[PDB]
Design a protein around this ligand. Structure first.
Ligand SMILES: CC(=O)SCCNC(=O)CCNC(=O)[C@H](O)C(C)(C)COP(=O)(O)OP(=O)(O)OC[C@H]1O[C@@H](n2cnc3c(N)ncnc32)[C@H](O)[C@@H]1OP(=O)(O)O
Length: 162
């Protein structure tokens, strides 16, 4: 039995452990040195302090999915931290999790959802196309992190809700 609600940790480091595993499972598309960035729990707090929200998906009490919503302005919000556990992918759960976040954004008053994603993330790019997102631009995003300089081929997308 699968449930979606606002995220609440079952134990203190649950989000950190789930996130690190999702990030390590996607080596081509994400910054891997999570120790050099603020914790995912601080990210959630930043979202909520600016009017955003962070959501969970659980099978029983087992976390299997996460998704964030970050406001840009009065009418535009950004999807972020969209992840489903490997064993539960490709069954329709991610689409259902997205549809919950979109409905929540629509009720809050957002009329546009934007996002960016690495081109290596094939499943996500197919889903966003299925959901009706439209490409804005492609770009090789340069990120300097510590003693490294990383290059991510990235897609930017928008969807109008109303
Ligand atoms: C804004 C951001 O956060 S960008 C970061 C996005 N996150 C990632 O890339 C992390 C890695 N991927 C994932 O965690 C997940 O696959 C998600 C969250 C992107 C998608 O959730 P899933 O459970 O896999 O998706 P779901 O089962 O609902 O599939 C929906 C659509 O995704 C696409 N898709 C899913 N699985 C596959 C697959 N194996 N091959 C190709 N396309 C696929 C299809 O378009 C599918 O629609 P369909 O079933 O009608 O053909």
């Amino acid at each position: 039995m699968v449930t979606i609600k606002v995220f609440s940790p079952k134990y203190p480091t649950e989000l950190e452990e789930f996130y690190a595993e999702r990030i390590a499972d996607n080596p081509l598309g994400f910054i891997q040195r999570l120790d050099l960035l603020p914790s995912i729990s601080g990210f959630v707090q930043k979202l909520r302090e600016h009017g955003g929200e962070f959501f969970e998906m659980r099978e029983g009490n087992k976390l299997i999915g996460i998704c964030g919503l970050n406001p840009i302005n009065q009418t535009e919000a950004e999807l972020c931290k969209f992840h489903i556990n490997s064993a539960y992918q490709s069954q329709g759960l991610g689409q259902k999790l997205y549809e919950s976040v979109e409905k929540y954004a629509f009720i809050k008053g957002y009329t546009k959802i934007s996002l960016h994603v690495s081109k290596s993330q094939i499943k996500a790019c197919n889903l966003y196309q299925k959901l009706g997102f439209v490409h804005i631009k492609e770009e090789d995003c340069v990120v300097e992190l510590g003693e490294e300089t990383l290059i991510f081929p990235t897609l930017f997308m928008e969807k109008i809700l109303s």
